[PDB]
Design a binder for these strands. Structure first.
Lengths: 250, 250
DNA sequence: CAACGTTGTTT
DNA sequence: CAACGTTGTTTT
């Protein structure tokens, strides 16, 4: 997808990410770079979103089932990118097609290093081509079986890479969201949907690059029907608008 | 090492190579190209020395435990060598480090074709760096045993290759002697020593590429303490000198 | 990390 | 040779 919501405050988001480690012990993920978390109802590519990844990416002797939550830049910048401005990337890595993921060098190399991450969101927006060229926006989320008390975060399959700015600076962590065919439920809205990891097991297996090979992890990548949506107002169309009105029903 | 002695006449050398085949039957090895054996007390790289190798290198239906003795050129000339004069080779292949042998493509490829051979010598010379001068002291180094009646030949682990002169001629067979760390007994003389195969079992297993894989053969390659030496005169320093005086004690 | 262009070794 | 080290555009 091309737009998400991820508005919850840091403390609330962290509690909504409670998980069981490989011994069945309930835990919260540990933050890296929490100050780069910027809550918004209206996230575009080139902004930072919180993602889950295995602690083994940061500590050599770590339990790969332990989770880090870290803000990462949406728009995978390949490790080999030669220019000094990540936004000057000449091709689009907002998304990564599931069907070609192991063929494309921007995605296959980091995937092969185990750089699998789970992109968090309240949900994603998608636009239906209406006739006129005016498109209708939808907010799309897990069914929620106030509402933001115990909201179920959407967990999208991503790949990340690490890029050292040639002229010096912090290693950039950036991600792409894997896309698949839209399920029947969404097929009238759009032809594509994100690779959604539905439940603790799918999330754990996507993250655990120490225990779960690329072949096994890619079996988790497919359309899913376990999703709902409502139409929203035009307010979300302008990426500068960050209000509860962006995902409010009409 | 960089210098050996191999001075015994062809008939005496062949009797000193008595071995048991795979049925326990005592045999002498069979010569190829005996006329290329030129006995000397003072052998340098690019000269020919007799080596043992499996008969299976020469006959498709042979008992791989049967041994050929054949003169080969010291200084492995890789099969890929493109120039017409083998002495133009820009790499020194007198020796092959045990620790990196599987990383070095000039040694790994022939090793993988089973081109393992046992380099024969009376013994080898090594030069000791004596602190406070650049004048080095030479030693003759041999198996523990005037004494040329029943002398025990030194049996060093070698790899060989086959090079066709591009402009035509006989296939060249050339060898490298594998090197390892010097044992404690020799550590004051030099930091390196040849890979010595101590006894009939080590020799048989190094030769038998039909029955003993690369992994198993490489377990035979290590420092050994079963070695003695004496200092010799400067006469051996000049590689043109071929006299009994080269390995005579002082 | 599959494709591709280069190089090969020790004291 | 063939094993090395080096290279590198993507989606709706």
């Amino acid at each position: 997808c091309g737009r998400t919501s991820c508005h919850l405050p840091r403390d609330v988001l962290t509690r909504a990410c409670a998980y069981q480690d490989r011994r069945g012990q309930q835990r919260l993920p540990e933050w890296r770079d929490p100050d780069k978390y910027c809550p918004s109802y209206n996230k575009s590519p080139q902004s930072n979103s919180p993602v889950l990844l295995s602690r083994l990416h940061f500590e050599k002797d770590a339990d790969s089932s332990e989770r880090i939550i870290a803000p990462m830049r949406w728009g995978l910048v390949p490790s080999w990118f030669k220019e000094s401005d990540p936004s000057k990337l000449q091709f689009n890595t907002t998304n990564c097609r599931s069907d070609t993921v192991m063929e494309k060098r921007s995605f296959k190399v980091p995937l092969g290093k185990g750089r699998r991450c789970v992109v968090l969101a309240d949900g994603f927006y998608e636009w239906q081509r209406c006739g006129t060229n005016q498109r209708q926006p939808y907010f799309i989320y897990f069914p929620q079986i106030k509402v933001w008390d115990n909201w179920r975060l959407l967990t999208m399959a991503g790949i990340f890479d690490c890029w050292e700015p040639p002229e010096g600076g912090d290693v950039l962590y950036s991600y792409t969201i894997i896309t698949v065919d839209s399920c029947k439920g969404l097929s009238d809205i759009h032809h594509r949907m994100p690779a959604i990891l539905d439940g603790e097991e799918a999330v754990s297996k996507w993250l655990d690059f120490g225990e779960v090979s690329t072949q096994e992890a890619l079996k988790l990548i497919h359309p899913t029907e376990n999703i709902t949506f409502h139409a929203v107002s035009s307010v979300v169309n302008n990426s500068r608008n960050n209000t509860p009105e962006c995902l409010a029903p009409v």
